[PDB]
Each structure stands twice: as structure tokens, then as C-alpha cells.
Paper text:
The enzyme is composed of two catalytic units, TrpA (α subunit) and TrpB (β subunit), that associate into a functional heterotetrameric αββα hydrolyase complex (TrpAB). The Streptococcus pneumoniae subunit α (SpTrpA) studied in the present work is a 258-residue protein which in its monomeric form assumes the canonical (β/α)8 TIM-barrel fold with three additional helices.
We have determined the crystal structure of S. pneumoniae TrpA, the α subunit of tryptophan synthase, a key enzyme in tryptophan biosynthesis, and have discovered that it exists in solution and in the crystal as a very unusual dimer formed by swapping the N-terminal H0–S1–H1–S2 portion of the TIM-barrel core. The dimeric fraction of the monomer–dimer mixture was crystallized in the monoclinic space group P21 with ten chains of SpTrpA in the asymmetric unit. Moreover, many of the previous examples with accidental TIM-barrel involvement in oligomerization are not bona fide 3D domain-swapping cases because the monomeric form does not exist. In the domain-swapping of SpTrpA, the N-terminal structural elements (N)–H0–S1–H1–S2 (with the sequence Mse1–Asp59) are contributed by the complementary subunit. The hinge-loop region involved in the domain swapping is the only part that adopts a different conformation in the monomeric and domain-swapped forms. The active site in each TIM barrel is restored and two α chains now contribute residues to each active site in the dimer.
Author numbering:
A (entry chain A): 0 to 179, 186 to 258
B (entry chain B): -2 to 178, 186 to 258
The structure:
């Protein structure tokens, strides 16, 4: 198509028998932060550089909190890789359905289609991708079409009900309710119950369950609970957690 | 509908229908004395307690491979409140005849929205894009959005992994080619650089550590030019002299 101006400009320098010189700078690494970027660029322009590489600093998307953040670091230090996890999961036989929770990047690096196909014969029945926006569900949903893997949607309890209906339309597996300042104190119990009524599949409460009291409260207004930090921490530190789980599983009505 | 209903929905509905609460523990895969080899043990432990399902976390691994100087520069930048959104806005402000090449890992791009990012830079000095951790097989996530634009997607080509293998990357290259890798008898790099140089239809630049004029001249003998990263970032930060080095480098004639 239309030739790109960067190719043209570099070809011209080469054609003139001059060496191409491209400095790299980190955007925002300046006394004035991003307000220093123009100054740096013009400084390099004045010296007649061919082009300038402008780096964007990398921030991770992990928002799970310290207990789980540390568990991830321990896991990586044991040499855990996505590929090795998939292979290990093929090994494991269980009647319990497994739900994979991952951020998008590891999935993307592995290959979404590959990941789904490689788990076809496993105990994996669900997939949660916390940083995948609803508008970009097409990155995963097509590959789950013929499979036994449900894409679980994360639904914010504080958003309007029409928005929640949109998120959960065509949802499979279950609905993961999340609740994240403001002079307005939201009644979480009310919102949870409202979501519960509206949904055609099970609604689980996925925040703030650390005690039997928490567990009973949320079971009154939903189908159940997801418990993360407490279990991860207990397993790591060797605290007994059997009693808590036994009691939780035995919740009736 | 016409498709088979998912087993997870059925299993959870059955627990609910029995009037029992659903209970789902989360575990981090690999967080065990035995690492991944402990996963089965943990799952069976939870199965024995009659949990409804198990959430199995995948650890997130950092993609940054830039080295200490640039790693530190990133942390400084973040501590100044730098965001992708603010960078884009700042770039709309900047007028320059020099073409700018954005280097980013995929995740920040993904978070921003690839299409948004490209459209938001449409009228700016950005003419190139480098995404070190974008696998060639998944170039469809970016390439389509660059189709009608003036932004070239620059490929990283490894000199060690053999040029013919990376034929697809090189043939479908725009902007320039970023090559990555008398003494030490690893003169395989010189040979590979020269081979890549002949085969390429656009300029080939060296992205090995250039820290001296000697480094610069060596690579210019077998390529069209160099990219200089750590040396410049460190010098700007530490107030080391850099103007002379750049002046000399820009002026170099073979």
C-alpha cells in the first residue's frame, strides 16, 4: 500500500551513505516526568538523530493483594510455567470441576486457541480472565464454542442493573460477583440479592469471605462464595483450614 | 440452544437445587513445597472435603528483559505518575521532524486498546511501533489496525536463531529491522548480520549494547546503523556527558 514515512526517511539516510542512529529514551524518566519529554526529544533532534525510540514503562495488572501476589512469586520460583501447568493438568483426574483464573497476557503468550484445545480432555470446566473487558470477549469466546469450558463473567455489584444484565447475557458456569471511596455506602447485600434474582445461572460472592459469619451472610443473598487469600495463606503457612471448609461446604438452605 | 450445555453450570445448579451452598476455594498453581508436582495433592485434598469447584490461579510473569538501567528508568517514570494515556496526550503536544518509534510490551497496549492507541496517535510524530513480546503468530492483534496508518510495525529478529527460520518476520517488515542477539570467535554474529543485511528490503539496525564509538563502528560495518539504549538513559539520568558521543555517532561515515 502507501509506503511508510519511517521506511522512507531511514532509506534516505542510508542512500546518503550515512549511518542510522536511534537513541532510546524512557518516556517520563525526567525531573519533570512526561512534561520533560518534549525537551528531551528536541535535545536529540538538535543533534540530528535518525529517529527516537520512546519507551513506555511497564505496569503489571495484578490486583490480587499481597497474599496471592507472594504466592505467585513462590510459584514462579518453583519454575511454574503456563506450558507445564497445562501438561500437569492433563495428568490430574478429579470429579471436581476446575476453573482457571488468569490474566490475559499469559493466555495470549501461550495462544488462546492452543490453551483451550490443550485443555479439552482435562478437568478444566471454566475460565476467568479478570482484566479482559466485556467489549473484547471475542478474543476468547469463539474458541470456547465447541468446548466444555465456560467463560465466567466478573460482575461489579455497584454498577447499574441494566449494565449487569448485559454482562451476564448468555453467561455460563456461574457469575462472579465482585465489590470493589465515596460518601455513598452501598448495601452490598441488597445488590447481591438483586443480581441473584436477575441471573439464570448461579451467582457466587467473590469478595470478603474470611469467617463463618461472612459465609452465612452471603449465602443468604447468593448461591455461594469464593474464598482466596484465606486458603492460599493457610496452605502456605500450614494452618489447618479443613474445619473452615467442612463447615462451609455443609451450609444448608 | 443447539450446543451442548456446559457441565460447570449443571454441577453448580445441582448443588443449589439440593439447597446446599456452593463453596469454591482458590489456589495458586505451583504454590506448594513440590511446585506444580504438588497441584494434584492439593486438588485431591480439597475434593476430599467436598468443595463445589476449585479456582486454579496462573502466576503472572513479568515480561521485562531490558536490563537494570532501563528497569530502574521505568520505575522512576512510574513514580512520576507516567501512564500510557498521559504519554499519548503529551505526544499530541509535541512537534518534531524526527520520526518517533514507540517501544512497549503488549500488556499496556492491550489495556489501552490497540485500535484506540493507533487511532489516538494518527496525527502525531509516531511512525513506528516495537512490541518485543508480541509473538509473530499473533500479529493479527496489531497488524490490521496499522493497515491504513503511517505507523510501521518493527520486527525483532534474533541473529542466533537463524535467519531462514524468521523469513516471515523479515519479509513482512516495515520501517526497519531490529537485529538482536576479530575476538571471542563468535564471529557468527557478524556473518548472520551480513546475511540478514543482504536479504532485507529495508534498513537493518543493530540493537546490541553500544556503549562506545568502537562498538558503533563495528556494527555499522555489517549493518545500516545502531540503536543505543542503556548508555543514553543512564547518561541523561546521571548527568554524564552524552552530546559528544551522539554528535560523533550521527556524523559517522563508513
Amino acid at each position: 500500500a502507501m509506503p511508510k514515512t519511517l521506511t522512507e526517511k531511514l532509506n534516505a539516510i542510508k542512500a546518503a551513505g550515512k549511518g542510522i542512529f536511534v537513541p532510546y529514551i524512557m518516556a517520563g524518566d525526567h525531573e519533570k516526568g512526561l512534561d520533560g519529554l518534549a525537551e528531551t526529544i528536541h535535545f536529540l533532534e538538535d543533534l540530528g538523530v535518525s529517529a527516537i525510540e520512546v519507551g513506555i514503562p511497564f505496569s503489571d495488572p495484578v490486583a490480587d493483594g499481597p497474599v496471592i501476589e507472594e504466592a505467585g512469586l513462590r510459584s514462579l520460583a518453583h519454575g511454574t510455567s503456563t506450558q507445564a501447568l497445562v501438561e500437569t493438568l492433563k495428568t490430574i483426574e478429579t470429579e471436581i470441576p476446575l476453573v482457571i483464573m488468569t490474566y490475559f497476557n499469559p493466555l495470549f503468550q501461550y495462544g488462546v486457541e492452543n490453551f483451550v484445545k490443550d485443555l479439552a480432555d482435562t478437568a478444566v470446566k471454566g475460565l476467568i480472565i479478570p482484566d479482559l473487558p466485556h467489549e473484547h470477549a471475542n478474543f476468547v469466546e469463539p474458541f470456547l464454542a465447541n468446548t466444555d469450558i465456560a467463560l465466567i463473567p466478573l460482575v461489579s455489584l455497584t454498577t447499574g442493573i441494566e449494565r449487569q444484565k448485559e454482562l451476564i447475557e448468555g453467561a455460563e458456569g456461574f457469575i462472579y460477583a465482585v465489590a470493589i471511596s465515596g460518601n455513598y455506602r452501598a448495601d452490598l447485600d441488597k445488590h447481591l440479592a438483586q443480581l441473584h434474582q436477575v441471573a439464570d445461572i448461579p451467582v457466587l460472592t467473590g469478595f470478603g469471605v474470611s469467617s463463618q459469619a461472612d459465609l452465612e451472610r452471603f449465602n443468604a443473598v447468593s448461591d455461594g462464595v469464593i474464598v482466596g487469600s484465606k486458603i492460599v495463606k493457610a496452605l502456605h503457612q500450614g494452618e489447618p483450614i479443613q474445619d473452615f471448609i467442612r463447615q462451609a461446604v455443609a451450609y444448608q438452605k
